[PDB]
């Protein structure tokens, strides 16, 4: 390695090092000192920032130094500790990506039952166990394989992992550790892309119809449970409970769980849409509408039934003609509007605007999606060349050159610099605490 080369690489990866340390350390201190940031969401980013911090302060610098000098000078035990720390931290980063992806998936697909158990305790337990499984997966074999085999194979002055002898070995580990997590993450991500609409429908109908896990008597008097699930119009409090037990599958005794309310809601809403597509009057307009207004009409069918909604003849035609304001005014003439005005006005605003403004704002959530997509894409592109190089090195011996190995190994470190720069700068509270910390002027 030439002197100019050494100076350039050392300076640049130095800068990248202190940028990683500064960023992730700022996440840690901001979380510690600002209670507004002490959210379960930020538990995960704190753990990620611990991994990226470890990588930023030890890994990039020891690896860049050993690569520039050409030999390892800190000894065998320091070598083993460095590789153990690097692989444990990196596998931890992957594991936290998986944990975030699953957390988001369950938050969208089980918006009621999962959100009820997203407690700081459970978050801390699963973060800690992600780190535990990373450590168990990498540290024992990196440090003690030499004593178990009986001799240390790695040359004096050099530093690498002994048990990754064969390229097929390291490619199997690359599948378990990288490829399968990446595929699971992507399949999730897409699944959330295809489920946000159903969650918005669920939350809309929970706002309008309410949620009770104990049976109550509705407007007309009949017995209902869950999110507006009517059991039976009979007057017998146990004629209701028998149909409840038949609907869930256990002796309900009148009380259900929130995931049973989610199951009951899914059966109800699927029945609503399936019926809509069976009804000759509602199918044309439902087909003509976008997703949000489709949700408004699903709302009306949930409240009044298909015959009752089909009774809105002229307003439904105005909906088919995209005459939103005239349809709003016309639906305001209805007894429906005069009997449940607060819900009817929300539904009407949904028809008029085609947005969720009458029910909820999704700005912060959409930006959180942008942040997560940025993080995972940075991960994929900075980590993919190395694992592709493993994949190739299994089929062919020594195709990929040593320079390429060095660069692809070094590139996996960069997403540790990128991760805090995603949520931190464009997310408020983080930005403001970063500012007041870098100013040394934080007094609560």
């Amino acid at each position: 390695k030439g002197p100019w080369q050494v100076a350039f690489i050392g300076i640049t990866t130095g800068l990248l090092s202190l940028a990683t340390v500064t960023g992730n350390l700022l996440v840690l201190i901001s979380f510690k000192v600002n209670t507004e940031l002490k959210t379960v969401n930020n538990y995960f980013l704190l753990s990620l920032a611990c991994a990226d911090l470890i990588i930023g302060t030890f890994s990039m610098n020891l690896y860049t130094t050993y690569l520039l000098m050409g030999h390892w000078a800190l000894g065998t035990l320091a070598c083993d500790l460095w590789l153990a720390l690097d692989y444990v931290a990196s596998q931890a980063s992957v594991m936290n990506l998986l944990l975030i992806s699953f957390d988001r998936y369950f938050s969208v697909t089980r918006p009621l039952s999962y959100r009820a158990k997203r407690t700081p305790r459970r978050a801390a337990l699963m973060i800690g166990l992600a780190w535990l499984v990373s450590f168990v997966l990498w540290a024992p074999a990196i440090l003690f394989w030499q004593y178990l085999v009986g001799e240390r194979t790695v040359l004096a002055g050099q530093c690498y992992i002994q048990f990754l002898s064969q390229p097929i070995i390291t490619f199997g580990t690359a599948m378990a550790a990288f490829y399968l997590p990446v595929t699971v993450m992507c399949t999730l991500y897409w699944r959330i892309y295809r489920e946000t609409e159903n969650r918005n429908i669920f939350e809309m109908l929970r706002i309008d119809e309410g949620l009770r896990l104990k049976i109550y008597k509705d407007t007309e008097g009949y017995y209902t449970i869950g999110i507006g699930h009517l059991l039976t119009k009979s007057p017998s409090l146990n004629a209701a409970k028998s149909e409840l037990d038949k609907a869930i599958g256990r002796n309900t005794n009148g009380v259900i769980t929130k995931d049973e309310a989610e199951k009951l809601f899914n059966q109800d809403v699927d029945a609503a849409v399936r019926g809509i597509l069976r009804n000759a009057k509602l199918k044309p307009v439902y087909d003509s509408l976008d997703a949000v207004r489709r949700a408004a009409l699903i709302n009306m069918v949930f409240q009044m039934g298909e015959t009752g909604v089909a009774g809105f003849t002229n307003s439904l035609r105005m909906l088919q003609q995209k005459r939103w304001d005239e349809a709003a005014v016309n639906l305001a003439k209805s007894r429906w509007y005069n009997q449940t005005p607060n819900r009817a006005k929300r539904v009407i605003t949904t028809f008029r605007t085609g947005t969720w403004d009458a029910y909820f704002s999704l700005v912060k959530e959409k930006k959180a999606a942008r942040t997560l997509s940025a993080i995972l894409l940075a991960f994929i592109l900075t980590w993919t060349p190395y694992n592709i190089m493993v994949l190739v090195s299994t089929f062919c011996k020594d195709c990929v050159p040593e320079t390429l190995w060095e660069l692809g190994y070094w590139l996996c470190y960069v997403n540790s610099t990128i991760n805090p720069m995603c949520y931190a700068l464009c997310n408020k509270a983080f930005r403001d605490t970063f500012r007041l910390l870098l100013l040394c002027r934080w007094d609560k």
Binding site: N41, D103, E203, S361, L362, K364, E365
Partner: peptide
């Protein structure tokens, strides 16, 4: 889980 956060 953001969704409910204020702007």
């Amino acid at each position: 889980d953001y969704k409910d956060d204020d702007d």
